[PDB]
Design a protein around this ligand. Structure first.
Ligand SMILES: *Cc1cc2c(nc3c(=O)[nH]c(=O)nc-3n2C[C@H](O)[C@H](O)[C@H](O)COP(=O)(O)OP(=O)(O)OC[C@H]2O[C@@H](n3cnc4c(N)ncnc43)[C@H](O)[C@@H]2O)c(*)c1C
Ligand SMILES: *[C@@H]1O[C@H](CO)[C@@H](O[C@@H]2O[C@H](CO)[C@@H](O[C@@H]3O[C@H](CO)[C@@H](O)[C@H](O)[C@@H]3O)[C@H](O)[C@H]2NC(C)=O)[C@H](O)[C@H]1NC(C)=O
Ligand SMILES: *[C@@H]1O[C@H](CO)[C@@H](O)[C@H](O)[C@H]1NC(C)=O
Ligand SMILES: [Mg+2]
Length: 502
């Protein structure tokens, strides 16, 4: 069986594969931990793949899937390995890890201003490729350079330019999807329902994206950014955050103001991240008017290329570092939760948040405003439904290093209580979420459990409608169409509709 798999792979020309090894220093273990981006799922007790396959072409990817199906393995796809819940490299059933790191080719077409992007490519590699080819082109996606396009675009992809250009998935014009039978389908082949579904319906559900075709987007040769940390007390920090929410959502689409926040007793720190599609004169004039309380000075505003701004906002030293997929910025175990809002947050919400942060220096928040282009895109244009009416995205994070692992339970408890505190102020009925911010606290499906599987649609509605709202129904239809046998599944994958043949 394990040798039948390898025999099948060899017969089909797939040669880059390594079977499980207990050797701490084996190539298997080296490849396994190479793209584990959350150390929370890195220890010895976690499930390990029986084999790791590294396909290097669309045919190798197709044949790998075909071979794996002859057996009874669970398929796991890994691009960047940034899954918050480690769903790309863990499974409660014996699984084969298909790692896509060798599928990292980016092809820029300056004549059509589009690009073909193999799904193993990271955002950083994509950004670097774009900046290299042109000074007037960029793309809208997340801020983390080591995030893989495979999972990221599959789940939407929100970033600093989303108020201008929407999500990464909102700018996909074609794609190559490899289905459960190993069929190689482009947009025309897969159909519009499936092409709709893959653009934010969540990774690991529809098949294996081989490559994305994206539209490259206009950017000025110079943009303006700032990254300013305000060190203040809770009263001022609360005033700043309460005003920020209005400034952020209301800003014109050419502007973005986001926040990173934390505390430690009396000391509160708020890192303001600013972006403007233009020069510093207009940028400073805008914030002087709308947010004079930030106390920004001329030297805070930095003019640079789009490429430089994305490296800068990511806290990288240089643009070159975008092209390093194995670069480890923060190597801490973490757990995060997210909220979307529909009504303005009361000042007391920010106050309470800051109070709880002051008691836990390992915790922090990330605040993003929607609006702009996000409110001009229809709720069903792609699976991501949180458009017009959505005000903010609020992220709560707790992170720790190896020397603090004994406080793990305490950290998680703190995060749980933070989330409970925020309940009354955020979206309700249901409490909304974001599939790229996958959260298993919401629950999960054991696909080996008959009674659960029979009621999968209703059960899955808990997280399904949080992620996709009314788009949930259409997603189920697309799923049934493209993966009726449920070859691509995980605790929160869209359920296919059953067949009476049971
Ligand atoms: C670690 C990390 C994540 C971030 C960060 N910043 C983000 C941001 O600024 N905006 C966002 O919208 N999201 C941000 N996130 C979260 C990431 O967007 C998500 O975690 C992405 O889903 C991660 O993608 P990836 O790096 O590829 O993670 P994987 O674990 O490999 O995949 C996730 C999921 O998708 C499936 N999958 C992978 N590859 C494919 C292909 N090619 N085809 C179909 N499905 C695929 C996996 O099986 C898994 O289920 C900042 C940081 C630091
Ligand atoms: C299967 O895939 C892995 C990962 O891509 C392959 O490992 C890679 O092999 C290449 C050589 O073909 C390595 O290139 C060079 O490595 C040396 C190491 O000292 C370095 O000096 C060079 O600058 C260059 O990096 C590459 O490092 C390596 N990548 C990783 C992540 O290990 C492997 O070759 C493939 N296996 C088979 C059988 O094809
Ligand atoms: C199936 O899932 C249900 C609900 O989670 C659980 O109560 C039950 O023990 C499971 N049954 C089996 C056979 O594992
Ligand atoms: Mg050894």
């Amino acid at each position: 069986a394990g040798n039948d798999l390898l025999s099948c792979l060899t017969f089909n020309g797939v040669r880059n594969h390594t079977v499980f090894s207990a050797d701490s220093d084996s190539d298997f273990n080296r490849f396994l931990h190479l793209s584990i981006q959350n150390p929370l799922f890195q220890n010895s007790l976690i499930s390990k793949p029986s084999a790791i396959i590294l396909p290097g072409s669309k045919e190798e990817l197709s044949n790998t899937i075909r071979c794996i199906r002859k057996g009874s393995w669970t398929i796991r796809l890994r691009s960047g390995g940034h899954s918050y819940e480690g769903l790309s490299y863990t499974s409660d059933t014996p699984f084969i890890l298909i790692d896509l790191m060798n599928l990292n080719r980016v092809s820029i077409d300056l004549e059509s201003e589009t690009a073909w992007v193999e799904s193993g490519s990271t955002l950083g590699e994509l950004y670097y490729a774009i900046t290299e080819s042109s000074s007037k082109l960029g793309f809208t996606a997340g801020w983390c350079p080591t995030v893989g396009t495979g999972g990221h675009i599959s789940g939407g992809g929100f970033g600093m330019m989303s108020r201008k250009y929407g999500l990464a998935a909102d700018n996909v014009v074609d794609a190559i999807l490899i289905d459960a039978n190993g069929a190689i389908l482009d947009r025309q082949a897969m159909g519009e329902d499936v092409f709709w579904a893959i653009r934010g319906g969540g990774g690991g559900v529809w098949g294996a994206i081989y490559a994305w075709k994206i539209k490259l987007l206009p950017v000025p040769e110079k943009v303006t950014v700032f990254r300013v940390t305000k060190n203040v007390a809770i009263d001022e920090a609360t005033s700043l955050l309460h005003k920020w929410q209005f400034v952020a959502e209301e800003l014109e689409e050419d502007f973005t103001l986001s926040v990173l926040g934390g505390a430690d007793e009396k000391q509160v720190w708020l890192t303001m991240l600013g972006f403007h599609f233009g020069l510093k004169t207009v940028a400073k004039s805008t914030f002087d008017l709308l947010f004079p309380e930030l106390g920004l000075v001329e030297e805070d505003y930095l003019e640079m290329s789009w490429g430089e701004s994305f490296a800068y906002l990511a806290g990288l030293e240089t643009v070159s570092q975008l092209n390093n997929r194995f670069l480890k910025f923060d190597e801490r175990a973490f757990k995060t939760k997210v909220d979307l809002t529909k009504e303005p947050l009361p000042s007391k919400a920010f106050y309470g948040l800051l109070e709880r942060l002051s008691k836990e220096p390992n915790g922090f928040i990330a605040l993003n405003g929607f609006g702009g282009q996000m409110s001009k895109i229809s709720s069903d244009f792609t699976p991501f439904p949180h458009r017009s009416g959505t005000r903010l995205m609020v992220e709560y994070i707790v992170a720790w290093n190896q020397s603090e692992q004994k406080k793990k339970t305490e950290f998680l408890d703190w995060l749980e209580k933070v989330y409970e505190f925020m309940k009354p102020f955020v979206s309700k009925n249901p409490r909304l979420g974001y599939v790229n911010h996958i959260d298993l606290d919401l629950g999960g499906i054991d696909w080996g459990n008959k009674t659960v599987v029979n009621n999968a649609i209703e059960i899955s509605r808990s997280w399904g409608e949080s992620y996709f709202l009314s788009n949930y129904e259409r997603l189920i239809r697309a799923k049934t169409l493209i993966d009726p046998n449920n070859v691509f599944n995980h605790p929160q994958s869209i359920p296919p509709m059953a067949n009476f043949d049971y």
